[PDB]
Amino acid sequence: QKSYLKSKGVDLSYMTLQEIKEANTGSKVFLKAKIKVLDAMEDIDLSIEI
Amino acid sequence: GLPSINISFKELATTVKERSARGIIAMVLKDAKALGLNEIHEKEDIPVDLSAENKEYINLALMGNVNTPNKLLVYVIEGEADIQTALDFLETKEFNYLCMPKAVEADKTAIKNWIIKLRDIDKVKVKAVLGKVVGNHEGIINFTTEDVLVGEKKYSVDEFTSRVAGLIAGTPLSQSVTYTKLSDVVDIPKMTKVDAESRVNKGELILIKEAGAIRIARGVNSLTELTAEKGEMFQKIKIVDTLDIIHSDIRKVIIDDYIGKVTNSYDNKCLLIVAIKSYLEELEKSALIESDSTVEIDFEAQKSYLKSKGVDLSYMTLQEIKEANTGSKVFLKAKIKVLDAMEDIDLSIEI
Amino acid sequence: MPKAVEADKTAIKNWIIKLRDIDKVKVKAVLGKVVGNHEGIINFTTEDVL
């Protein structure tokens, strides 16, 4: 969103960070995510104690 | 147009710092078979060019006291013009340890002179282990113990110094070579403890039979008479090792970041100070040195550069003098705290 | 493709990676002997299978 605003020529300063987040993006839309991927069992290690 | 906009994840990686490498061994060697460098970075790999004695050299160098040396560099050329090609290839590629198995005394002297020339010019202090050097330099290392008996076999001084090179490379920075017992060594020539003390005062490294084992006498430099500015801590190769690593990392990162890329300015000076402070915090967290002191703009060097620019000392504020133009020149004040390893302990228990 | 020649297999791999990189069509293919440097294609180098 900051890059879009810079490309639009708008000076980034003198506005709220929340305002920056909620600023109009035109037709463009920008988002950020992150996911956690589960795996399968392929290696098993155990130690026996006498 | 009609943005058919893409929906992709970002391929992620873990951040890793990549400061100047340490513990590498550059060992140039001579042979008449398959002349050329062997770059033996994989362990227990013996190219057929290197002879049986060279094979034993590899076996000694590969194994260390605590760890395996990070990387072993082996070169092969004819016995003639060893020094020229060694100098050229060591200039081509950086190193942390240097040892010539077949160095003559003249070759050892030439190696020492070239090493000190680089340390004066490149400003990066390096180390070199040699069989018998009486030189007054700290980076060079001398081991004055002949007829070393390792596993019931005749060993030249060069062979065991090459072994010690890998031993030191495998030594972690938190650990010192002090009282490092060698299981492989079976016997050393008998010698008085007073002689050992005298040799330590000279700075020569030798072997001692202590605690029922053959151990390292000292980690002191081969330099004989340290100047007043250096002090006894500079005699320790372990202590100077972290200084050399710090200088190498600092110069490398400065070349990476500051030369040309950023024009020098007061804000740039503040950013450089912040980066240096971050580096000092990194060193402190490394726990190799304590490093309580902080690096700041040397106002004495600042005054020197204002004198060079000719700006008056008077009528301008201390801060104003400090924040004045620095041109292309950069001035810093280096003060740190260097931490030492525990070697001798006293208490007085009481009844 | 049971009877794809190595040229045909290479063309298949190139088309598949082209879709996966531009058309964003995430599809997978399996081939017998392909040293391709992509994950969408699948290589199974086992011969004389009984």
CSV table of C-alpha atoms in Angstrom, one decimal:
chain,number,residue,atom,x,y,z
A,1,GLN,CA,0.0,0.0,0.0
A,2,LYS,CA,2.9,2.4,0.8
A,3,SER,CA,4.4,1.6,-2.6
A,4,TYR,CA,1.1,2.2,-4.3
A,5,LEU,CA,0.8,5.6,-2.6
A,6,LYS,CA,4.3,6.5,-3.6
A,7,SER,CA,3.6,5.5,-7.2
A,8,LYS,CA,0.5,7.8,-6.9
A,9,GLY,CA,2.9,10.6,-5.9
A,10,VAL,CA,1.2,11.2,-2.5
A,11,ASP,CA,3.6,12.3,0.2
A,12,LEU,CA,3.6,9.6,2.8
A,13,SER,CA,4.1,12.0,5.8
A,14,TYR,CA,1.5,13.8,7.9
A,15,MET,CA,-1.1,11.0,7.9
A,16,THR,CA,-2.0,8.3,10.5
A,17,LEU,CA,-0.6,4.8,10.0
A,18,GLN,CA,-4.2,3.6,10.4
A,19,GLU,CA,-5.1,6.1,7.7
A,20,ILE,CA,-2.3,4.7,5.5
A,21,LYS,CA,-3.7,1.2,6.0
A,22,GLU,CA,-7.3,2.4,5.2
A,23,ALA,CA,-6.3,4.8,2.4
A,24,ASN,CA,-7.9,4.2,-0.9
A,25,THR,CA,-6.0,1.7,-3.2
A,26,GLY,CA,-8.0,2.4,-6.3
A,27,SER,CA,-8.7,-0.8,-8.3
A,28,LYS,CA,-5.6,-2.3,-6.7
A,29,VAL,CA,-5.8,-4.5,-3.6
A,30,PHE,CA,-2.9,-5.4,-1.3
A,31,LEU,CA,-2.9,-8.0,1.4
A,32,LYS,CA,-0.5,-10.0,3.6
A,33,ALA,CA,-0.8,-13.5,5.0
A,34,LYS,CA,1.1,-16.4,6.4
A,35,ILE,CA,0.2,-20.1,6.9
A,36,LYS,CA,1.4,-23.1,8.8
A,37,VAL,CA,1.7,-26.4,6.8
A,38,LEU,CA,1.3,-29.8,8.4
A,39,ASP,CA,3.5,-32.7,7.3
A,40,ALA,CA,3.5,-36.5,7.4
A,41,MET,CA,5.3,-39.1,9.5
A,42,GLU,CA,8.5,-40.3,7.8
A,43,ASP,CA,11.2,-40.4,10.5
A,44,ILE,CA,10.7,-41.9,14.0
A,45,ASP,CA,13.4,-41.9,16.7
A,46,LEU,CA,13.1,-43.3,20.2
A,47,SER,CA,15.5,-44.2,23.0
A,48,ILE,CA,14.9,-47.0,25.5
A,49,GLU,CA,16.0,-46.6,29.1
A,50,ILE,CA,17.0,-49.6,31.1
B,1,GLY,CA,-4.7,-4.6,-19.3
B,2,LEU,CA,-7.4,-6.6,-17.5
B,3,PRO,CA,-5.0,-7.4,-14.6
B,4,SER,CA,-5.1,-11.2,-14.2
B,5,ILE,CA,-3.3,-10.5,-10.9
B,6,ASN,CA,-1.2,-13.3,-9.6
B,7,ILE,CA,-1.7,-15.0,-6.2
B,8,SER,CA,1.6,-16.3,-4.9
B,9,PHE,CA,3.3,-17.0,-1.6
B,10,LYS,CA,6.8,-15.6,-0.9
B,11,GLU,CA,9.6,-18.2,-0.8
B,12,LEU,CA,11.0,-17.7,2.7
B,13,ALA,CA,14.5,-18.2,4.1
B,14,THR,CA,16.1,-17.8,7.5
B,15,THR,CA,18.4,-14.8,8.1
B,16,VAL,CA,22.0,-15.7,8.6
B,17,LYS,CA,24.9,-13.3,9.1
B,18,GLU,CA,27.9,-13.8,6.8
B,19,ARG,CA,30.9,-12.1,8.4
B,20,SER,CA,34.5,-12.8,7.4
B,21,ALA,CA,35.3,-16.5,7.6
B,22,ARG,CA,37.5,-17.7,10.4
B,23,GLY,CA,39.5,-20.9,11.1
B,24,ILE,CA,40.3,-21.6,7.5
B,25,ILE,CA,43.7,-23.2,6.8
B,26,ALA,CA,45.7,-22.3,3.7
B,27,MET,CA,48.5,-24.9,3.4
B,28,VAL,CA,50.6,-24.5,0.3
B,29,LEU,CA,52.7,-27.6,-0.4
B,30,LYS,CA,55.2,-28.9,-2.9
B,31,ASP,CA,55.2,-32.1,-5.0
B,32,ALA,CA,56.2,-33.3,-8.5
B,33,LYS,CA,52.8,-35.0,-9.2
B,34,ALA,CA,49.7,-33.3,-10.5
B,35,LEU,CA,50.9,-29.8,-9.8
B,36,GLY,CA,48.0,-27.5,-8.7
B,37,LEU,CA,45.7,-26.8,-5.8
B,38,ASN,CA,43.7,-29.7,-4.4
B,39,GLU,CA,41.1,-27.6,-2.4
B,40,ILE,CA,40.5,-30.4,0.1
B,41,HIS,CA,37.4,-29.1,1.8
B,42,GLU,CA,35.9,-32.6,2.1
B,43,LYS,CA,37.4,-34.7,4.9
B,44,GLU,CA,39.4,-37.9,4.4
B,45,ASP,CA,39.9,-37.2,0.7
B,46,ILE,CA,43.5,-37.8,-0.5
B,47,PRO,CA,44.3,-36.9,-4.1
B,48,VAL,CA,47.1,-39.2,-5.4
B,49,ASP,CA,49.3,-36.2,-6.1
B,50,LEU,CA,50.3,-35.8,-2.5
B,51,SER,CA,52.9,-38.3,-1.3
B,52,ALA,CA,52.9,-40.5,1.9
B,53,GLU,CA,54.5,-37.7,4.0
B,54,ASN,CA,52.0,-35.3,2.5
B,55,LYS,CA,49.2,-37.8,3.2
B,56,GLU,CA,50.3,-37.9,6.9
B,57,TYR,CA,50.3,-34.0,6.8
B,58,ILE,CA,46.7,-34.2,5.6
B,59,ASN,CA,45.8,-36.7,8.3
B,60,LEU,CA,47.4,-34.5,11.0
B,61,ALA,CA,45.7,-31.3,9.8
B,62,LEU,CA,42.2,-32.7,9.3
B,63,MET,CA,41.8,-33.7,12.9
B,64,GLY,CA,41.9,-31.1,15.6
B,65,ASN,CA,41.7,-30.8,19.4
B,66,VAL,CA,38.0,-29.9,19.7
B,67,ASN,CA,36.7,-29.4,16.1
B,68,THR,CA,37.7,-30.1,12.6
B,69,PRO,CA,39.2,-27.1,10.8
B,70,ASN,CA,36.6,-25.3,8.8
B,71,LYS,CA,38.3,-25.5,5.4
B,72,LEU,CA,41.7,-26.9,4.4
B,73,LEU,CA,43.5,-25.4,1.3
B,74,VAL,CA,46.2,-27.5,-0.2
B,75,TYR,CA,48.3,-26.5,-3.2
B,76,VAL,CA,50.8,-28.6,-5.2
B,77,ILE,CA,53.7,-27.3,-7.3
B,78,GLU,CA,57.3,-28.3,-7.9
B,79,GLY,CA,59.8,-27.5,-5.1
B,80,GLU,CA,61.2,-24.6,-7.2
B,81,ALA,CA,59.5,-21.3,-6.9
B,82,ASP,CA,57.3,-22.4,-4.0
B,83,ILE,CA,57.4,-18.9,-2.4
B,84,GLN,CA,56.3,-17.1,-5.6
B,85,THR,CA,53.2,-19.2,-6.2
B,86,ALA,CA,52.4,-19.3,-2.5
B,87,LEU,CA,52.5,-15.5,-2.3
B,88,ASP,CA,50.4,-15.2,-5.4
B,89,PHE,CA,47.7,-17.6,-4.4
B,90,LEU,CA,47.5,-16.3,-0.8
B,91,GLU,CA,47.1,-12.8,-2.3
B,92,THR,CA,44.4,-14.2,-4.5
B,93,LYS,CA,42.4,-15.9,-1.7
B,94,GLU,CA,42.1,-14.9,1.9
B,95,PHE,CA,43.3,-17.1,4.8
B,96,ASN,CA,43.4,-17.5,8.5
B,97,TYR,CA,46.2,-20.0,8.9
B,98,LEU,CA,49.4,-20.6,6.9
B,99,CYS,CA,52.1,-23.3,7.1
B,100,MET,CA,54.7,-24.5,4.6
B,101,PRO,CA,55.6,-28.1,5.3
B,102,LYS,CA,58.8,-27.8,3.2
B,103,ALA,CA,59.8,-24.2,4.1
B,104,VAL,CA,63.6,-23.6,4.5
B,105,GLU,CA,64.7,-21.0,6.9
B,106,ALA,CA,65.1,-18.4,4.1
B,107,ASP,CA,61.6,-19.4,2.9
B,108,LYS,CA,60.3,-19.0,6.4
B,109,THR,CA,61.8,-15.6,6.7
B,110,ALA,CA,60.4,-14.5,3.4
B,111,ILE,CA,57.0,-15.8,4.5
B,112,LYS,CA,57.2,-13.8,7.7
B,113,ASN,CA,58.2,-10.6,5.9
B,114,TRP,CA,55.4,-11.0,3.4
B,115,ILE,CA,52.9,-11.7,6.2
B,116,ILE,CA,54.0,-8.6,8.1
B,117,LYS,CA,53.9,-6.5,4.9
B,118,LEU,CA,50.3,-7.6,4.3
B,119,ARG,CA,49.4,-7.0,8.0
B,120,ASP,CA,50.8,-3.4,7.7
B,121,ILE,CA,49.2,-2.7,4.3
B,122,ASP,CA,45.9,-4.7,4.4
B,123,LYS,CA,45.6,-3.8,8.2
B,124,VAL,CA,44.2,-7.3,8.8
B,125,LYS,CA,46.4,-9.2,11.2
B,126,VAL,CA,47.0,-12.8,10.2
B,127,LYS,CA,48.7,-15.8,11.8
B,128,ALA,CA,51.5,-18.2,10.6
B,129,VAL,CA,53.0,-21.2,12.4
B,130,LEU,CA,56.6,-22.1,11.5
B,131,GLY,CA,59.1,-24.6,12.7
B,132,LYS,CA,61.8,-22.2,13.9
B,133,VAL,CA,61.5,-18.4,13.8
B,134,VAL,CA,63.3,-16.0,16.1
B,135,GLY,CA,61.4,-13.1,14.6
B,136,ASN,CA,59.9,-10.3,16.7
B,137,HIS,CA,56.4,-10.4,15.2
B,138,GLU,CA,53.3,-11.5,16.9
B,139,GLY,CA,51.3,-13.0,14.0
B,140,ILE,CA,54.1,-15.5,13.2
B,141,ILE,CA,54.2,-18.5,15.6
B,142,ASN,CA,57.4,-20.4,16.6
B,143,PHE,CA,57.5,-24.0,18.0
B,144,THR,CA,60.9,-24.8,19.2
B,145,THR,CA,60.7,-28.5,20.1
B,146,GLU,CA,62.7,-31.0,18.0
B,147,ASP,CA,62.5,-34.8,18.0
B,148,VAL,CA,58.8,-34.8,18.6
B,149,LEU,CA,57.7,-38.4,19.0
B,150,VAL,CA,54.1,-38.9,18.0
B,151,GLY,CA,52.8,-42.5,17.9
B,152,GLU,CA,56.3,-44.0,17.8
B,153,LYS,CA,57.4,-42.2,14.6
B,154,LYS,CA,60.1,-39.6,13.7
B,155,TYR,CA,58.4,-36.2,13.1
B,156,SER,CA,59.9,-33.1,11.7
B,157,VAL,CA,59.2,-29.8,13.4
B,158,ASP,CA,57.3,-28.7,10.3
B,159,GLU,CA,55.1,-31.8,10.4
B,160,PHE,CA,54.0,-31.2,14.0
B,161,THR,CA,53.5,-27.5,13.5
B,162,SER,CA,51.2,-28.4,10.6
B,163,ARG,CA,49.4,-30.6,13.0
B,164,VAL,CA,49.2,-27.7,15.5
B,165,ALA,CA,47.8,-25.5,12.8
B,166,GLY,CA,44.8,-27.8,12.4
B,167,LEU,CA,44.6,-28.2,16.1
B,168,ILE,CA,44.3,-24.4,16.6
B,169,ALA,CA,41.8,-24.1,13.7
B,170,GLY,CA,39.6,-26.7,15.4
B,171,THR,CA,40.0,-24.8,18.7
B,172,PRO,CA,36.8,-22.8,19.5
B,173,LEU,CA,37.2,-19.1,20.2
B,174,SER,CA,35.8,-19.7,23.8
B,175,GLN,CA,38.6,-22.2,24.4
B,176,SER,CA,42.3,-21.7,24.8
B,177,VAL,CA,45.2,-23.9,23.7
B,178,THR,CA,46.5,-23.7,27.3
B,179,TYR,CA,47.2,-27.2,28.7
B,180,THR,CA,45.9,-29.0,25.6
B,181,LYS,CA,46.8,-32.6,26.1
B,182,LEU,CA,47.7,-34.7,23.0
B,183,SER,CA,46.8,-38.3,23.0
B,184,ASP,CA,48.6,-39.0,19.7
B,185,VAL,CA,52.0,-37.8,21.0
B,186,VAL,CA,53.7,-40.6,22.8
B,187,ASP,CA,56.9,-39.0,24.0
B,188,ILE,CA,58.8,-35.7,24.0
B,189,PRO,CA,62.5,-35.1,24.8
B,190,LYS,CA,63.1,-34.7,28.6
B,191,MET,CA,63.6,-31.1,29.6
B,192,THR,CA,63.6,-29.1,32.8
B,193,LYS,CA,60.6,-27.0,33.9
B,194,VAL,CA,63.0,-24.0,34.3
B,195,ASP,CA,63.8,-24.4,30.6
B,196,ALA,CA,60.0,-24.4,29.9
B,197,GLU,CA,59.6,-21.2,31.8
B,198,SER,CA,62.5,-19.6,30.0
B,199,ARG,CA,61.1,-20.6,26.6
B,200,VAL,CA,57.7,-19.2,27.6
B,201,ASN,CA,59.3,-15.9,28.6
B,202,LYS,CA,61.0,-16.0,25.2
B,203,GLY,CA,57.6,-16.6,23.6
B,204,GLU,CA,58.4,-19.9,21.9
B,205,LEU,CA,55.7,-22.6,22.1
B,206,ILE,CA,56.8,-26.0,23.3
B,207,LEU,CA,55.3,-29.2,24.8
B,208,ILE,CA,55.1,-30.1,28.4
B,209,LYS,CA,54.4,-33.4,30.2
B,210,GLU,CA,51.9,-32.3,32.8
B,211,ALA,CA,49.0,-34.1,34.6
B,212,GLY,CA,50.4,-37.3,33.2
B,213,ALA,CA,50.0,-36.1,29.7
B,214,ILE,CA,51.8,-34.1,27.0
B,215,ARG,CA,50.2,-30.7,26.9
B,216,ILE,CA,50.7,-27.3,25.3
B,217,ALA,CA,53.1,-25.0,27.0
B,218,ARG,CA,51.5,-21.7,26.1
B,219,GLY,CA,49.4,-19.7,23.6
B,220,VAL,CA,51.7,-16.8,23.5
B,221,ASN,CA,52.9,-15.2,20.3
B,222,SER,CA,56.4,-15.7,18.9
B,223,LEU,CA,57.1,-12.0,19.3
B,224,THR,CA,59.8,-11.4,21.9
B,225,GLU,CA,59.6,-7.9,23.2
B,226,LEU,CA,56.1,-6.4,23.1
B,227,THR,CA,55.9,-2.7,23.2
B,228,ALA,CA,54.2,-0.8,26.0
B,229,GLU,CA,51.0,-0.1,24.0
B,230,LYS,CA,50.5,-3.7,23.2
B,231,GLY,CA,50.7,-5.3,26.7
B,232,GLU,CA,50.8,-8.9,27.8
B,233,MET,CA,47.3,-9.6,26.4
B,234,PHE,CA,48.6,-8.9,22.9
B,235,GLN,CA,51.2,-11.7,23.4
B,236,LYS,CA,48.3,-14.2,23.6
B,237,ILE,CA,47.4,-15.5,20.1
B,238,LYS,CA,43.9,-16.3,21.4
B,239,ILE,CA,43.4,-12.7,22.5
B,240,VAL,CA,44.7,-11.2,19.2
B,241,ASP,CA,42.6,-13.7,17.3
B,242,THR,CA,39.3,-12.0,18.2
B,243,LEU,CA,40.8,-8.6,17.5
B,244,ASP,CA,41.8,-9.8,14.0
B,245,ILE,CA,38.4,-11.2,13.3
B,246,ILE,CA,36.7,-8.0,14.5
B,247,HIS,CA,38.9,-5.9,12.3
B,248,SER,CA,38.3,-8.1,9.3
B,249,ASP,CA,34.5,-8.1,9.8
B,250,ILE,CA,34.5,-4.3,10.3
B,251,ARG,CA,36.5,-3.5,7.2
B,252,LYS,CA,34.5,-6.0,5.1
B,253,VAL,CA,31.2,-4.5,6.2
B,254,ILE,CA,32.5,-0.9,5.8
B,255,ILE,CA,33.6,-1.7,2.2
B,256,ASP,CA,30.3,-3.4,1.6
B,257,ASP,CA,28.2,-0.4,2.9
B,258,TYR,CA,29.9,2.9,3.1
B,259,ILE,CA,32.6,3.5,0.4
B,260,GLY,CA,31.0,5.1,-2.6
B,261,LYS,CA,27.4,4.0,-1.8
B,262,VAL,CA,26.7,6.8,0.7
B,263,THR,CA,28.2,10.3,0.8
B,264,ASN,CA,29.6,11.2,4.2
B,265,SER,CA,27.3,13.4,6.3
B,266,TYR,CA,26.5,14.1,9.9
B,267,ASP,CA,23.3,11.9,9.7
B,268,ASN,CA,25.4,9.3,7.9
B,269,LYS,CA,27.9,9.6,10.7
B,270,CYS,CA,25.2,8.9,13.3
B,271,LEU,CA,23.9,5.9,11.3
B,272,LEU,CA,27.5,4.6,11.1
B,273,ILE,CA,27.8,5.0,14.9
B,274,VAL,CA,24.5,3.1,15.3
B,275,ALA,CA,25.8,0.3,13.1
B,276,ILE,CA,29.1,0.1,15.0
B,277,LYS,CA,27.1,0.0,18.3
B,278,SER,CA,25.1,-2.9,16.9
B,279,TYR,CA,28.3,-4.7,15.9
B,280,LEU,CA,29.6,-4.1,19.5
B,281,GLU,CA,26.4,-5.6,20.8
B,282,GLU,CA,26.9,-8.6,18.5
B,283,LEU,CA,30.5,-9.0,19.9
B,284,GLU,CA,29.2,-8.8,23.5
B,285,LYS,CA,26.5,-11.4,22.9
B,286,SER,CA,29.2,-13.6,21.3
B,287,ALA,CA,30.7,-13.5,24.8
B,288,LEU,CA,34.3,-13.8,23.4
B,289,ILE,CA,34.9,-10.2,24.7
B,290,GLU,CA,32.9,-8.1,27.1
B,291,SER,CA,33.2,-4.9,25.1
B,292,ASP,CA,31.6,-2.4,27.5
B,293,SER,CA,33.2,0.6,25.8
B,294,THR,CA,31.5,2.4,23.0
B,295,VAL,CA,32.8,3.7,19.7
B,296,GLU,CA,32.2,7.4,19.1
B,297,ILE,CA,33.4,10.1,16.7
B,298,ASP,CA,36.9,11.0,18.0
B,299,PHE,CA,36.5,14.7,18.8
B,300,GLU,CA,40.3,14.8,18.7
B,301,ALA,CA,40.3,13.4,15.2
B,302,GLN,CA,37.3,15.7,14.6
B,303,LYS,CA,39.4,18.7,15.6
B,304,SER,CA,42.2,17.4,13.4
B,305,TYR,CA,39.9,17.3,10.4
B,306,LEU,CA,38.4,20.8,11.2
B,307,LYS,CA,42.0,22.0,11.3
B,308,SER,CA,42.5,20.3,7.9
B,309,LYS,CA,39.4,22.1,6.6
B,310,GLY,CA,40.7,25.2,8.5
B,311,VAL,CA,37.5,25.9,10.4
B,312,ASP,CA,38.1,27.8,13.6
B,313,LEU,CA,37.9,26.1,17.0
B,314,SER,CA,36.4,29.2,18.6
B,315,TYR,CA,32.9,30.7,18.2
B,316,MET,CA,31.5,27.4,17.0
B,317,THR,CA,29.7,25.0,19.4
B,318,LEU,CA,31.2,21.8,20.6
B,319,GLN,CA,28.4,20.0,18.8
B,320,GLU,CA,28.7,22.3,15.8
B,321,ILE,CA,32.4,21.5,15.6
B,322,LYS,CA,31.5,17.8,16.0
B,323,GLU,CA,28.7,18.0,13.3
B,324,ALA,CA,30.8,19.9,10.8
B,325,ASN,CA,31.5,18.6,7.3
B,326,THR,CA,33.8,15.6,7.1
B,327,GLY,CA,34.2,15.4,3.3
B,328,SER,CA,35.3,12.0,2.1
B,329,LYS,CA,37.3,11.4,5.3
B,330,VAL,CA,35.9,9.3,8.2
B,331,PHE,CA,37.2,9.5,11.7
B,332,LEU,CA,36.4,7.0,14.5
B,333,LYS,CA,37.6,6.3,18.0
B,334,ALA,CA,38.3,2.6,18.8
B,335,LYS,CA,38.1,1.5,22.5
B,336,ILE,CA,36.8,-1.9,23.6
B,337,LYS,CA,37.1,-4.4,26.4
B,338,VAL,CA,38.9,-7.7,25.7
B,339,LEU,CA,38.1,-10.7,27.7
B,340,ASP,CA,40.7,-13.3,28.9
B,341,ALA,CA,40.5,-17.0,29.5
B,342,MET,CA,40.9,-18.5,33.0
B,343,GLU,CA,44.4,-19.9,33.2
B,344,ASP,CA,45.5,-19.6,36.9
B,345,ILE,CA,43.2,-19.7,40.0
B,346,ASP,CA,44.0,-18.9,43.7
B,347,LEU,CA,42.0,-19.4,46.8
B,348,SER,CA,43.0,-19.7,50.5
B,349,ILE,CA,40.7,-22.2,52.2
B,350,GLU,CA,41.0,-22.0,56.0
B,351,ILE,CA,40.6,-24.2,59.0
C,1,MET,CA,2.1,-39.9,-22.2
C,2,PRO,CA,3.1,-43.6,-22.7
C,3,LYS,CA,4.8,-42.9,-26.0
C,4,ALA,CA,6.2,-39.4,-25.6
C,5,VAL,CA,9.7,-39.1,-27.0
C,6,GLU,CA,12.2,-37.1,-24.9
C,7,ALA,CA,11.5,-34.1,-27.1
C,8,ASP,CA,7.8,-34.6,-26.4
C,9,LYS,CA,8.5,-34.9,-22.7
C,10,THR,CA,10.6,-31.7,-22.8
C,11,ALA,CA,7.7,-29.9,-24.5
C,12,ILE,CA,5.3,-31.2,-22.0
C,13,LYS,CA,7.5,-30.0,-19.1
C,14,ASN,CA,8.0,-26.6,-20.7
C,15,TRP,CA,4.3,-26.1,-21.3
C,16,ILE,CA,3.4,-27.3,-17.7
C,17,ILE,CA,6.0,-24.9,-16.2
C,18,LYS,CA,4.8,-22.1,-18.5
C,19,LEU,CA,1.2,-22.6,-17.2
C,20,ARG,CA,2.4,-22.9,-13.6
C,21,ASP,CA,4.4,-19.7,-13.9
C,22,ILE,CA,2.2,-17.5,-16.0
C,23,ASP,CA,-1.3,-19.0,-16.2
C,24,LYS,CA,-1.1,-19.9,-12.5
C,25,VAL,CA,-2.5,-23.4,-13.4
C,26,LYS,CA,-1.1,-25.7,-10.7
C,27,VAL,CA,-1.1,-29.1,-12.4
C,28,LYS,CA,1.3,-32.1,-12.2
C,29,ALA,CA,2.6,-34.5,-14.7
C,30,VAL,CA,4.6,-37.8,-14.4
C,31,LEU,CA,7.4,-38.7,-16.8
C,32,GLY,CA,9.8,-41.7,-17.0
C,33,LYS,CA,13.2,-40.2,-17.6
C,34,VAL,CA,13.3,-36.4,-17.2
C,35,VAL,CA,16.1,-34.4,-15.5
C,36,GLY,CA,14.0,-31.3,-15.5
C,37,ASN,CA,14.6,-28.7,-12.7
C,38,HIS,CA,10.9,-28.2,-11.8
C,39,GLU,CA,8.7,-29.7,-9.2
C,40,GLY,CA,5.4,-29.8,-11.1
C,41,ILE,CA,6.8,-32.5,-13.3
C,42,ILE,CA,7.4,-35.9,-11.8
C,43,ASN,CA,10.3,-38.2,-12.7
C,44,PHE,CA,10.2,-42.0,-12.1
C,45,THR,CA,13.6,-43.5,-13.1
C,46,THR,CA,13.0,-47.3,-12.6
C,47,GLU,CA,13.3,-49.7,-15.5
C,48,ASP,CA,12.9,-53.5,-16.0
C,49,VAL,CA,9.9,-53.4,-13.7
C,50,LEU,CA,8.1,-56.8,-13.3
